[PDB]
Ligand binder design. Structure first.
Ligand code: WAY
Ligand code: CA
Ligand code: ZN
Ligand code: ZN
Length: 158
């Protein structure tokens, strides 16, 4: 029922994290778009400047929300439904430990999950699906959306 009115989308990174170098964070998001763009005709373009539909940034406990973060563990990130404005945004916890290795919460795992919500997908009951409510580490060497997620995204965007 909920979906973007166009396959063209843009995004902008407000800032990186001192936890890892900027290059490590940049390739992390690029891999996320590739995995989702592999089974979707969506086009993602990075904007050097200006406001983008999906802006990614790292926040801290209190930052202007009715229910901010609960500390290190808990909300690893959050986003609002899609919309021609603030919606479609995505915030990450800066108080947590972001690493590209298998430690704490992998940035790629949370990143792929928030995009799923922006695509109009709801939490799935499959533990192998990225939309699973519980955080789980997976081998990004060749991970691909399972049949459950592929059937759902295809049914929405076709
Ligand atoms: C692999 O991707 C993700 C993305 C978000 C989260 S999460 O902690 O924000 N998370 C799910 C959750 C986690 C562990 C125990 N209970 C619930 C949530 C929590 C804690 C509170 C409210 C919403 C979510 C949510 O689903 N956001 O997408 C966990 C894993
Ligand atoms: Ca948290
Ligand atoms: Zn926030
Ligand atoms: Zn979720």
């Amino acid at each position: 029922t909920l979906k973007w009115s166009k396959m063209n989308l843009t995004y902008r990174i407000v800032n990186y994290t001192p936890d890892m170098t900027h290059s490590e964070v940049e390739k992390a998001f690029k891999k996320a778009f590739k995995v989702w763009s592999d089974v979707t005709p969506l086009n993602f373009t990075r904007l050097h400047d200006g406001i983008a539909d999906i802006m990614i940034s790292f926040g801290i406990k209190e930052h202007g929300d009715f229910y901010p973060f609960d500390g290190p563990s808990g909300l690893l990130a959050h986003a609002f439904p899609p919309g021609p404005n603030y919606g479609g945004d995505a915030h990450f916890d800066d108080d947590e430990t972001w690493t590209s290795s298998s430690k704490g919460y992998n940035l790629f795992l949370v990143a792929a999950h928030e995009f799923g919500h922006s695509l109009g997908l709801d939490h799935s009951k499959d533990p192998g699906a990225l939309m699973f409510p519980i955080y789980t580490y997976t081998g990004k060497s060749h991970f691909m959306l399972p049949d459950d997620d592929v059937q759902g995204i295809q049914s929405l965007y076709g």
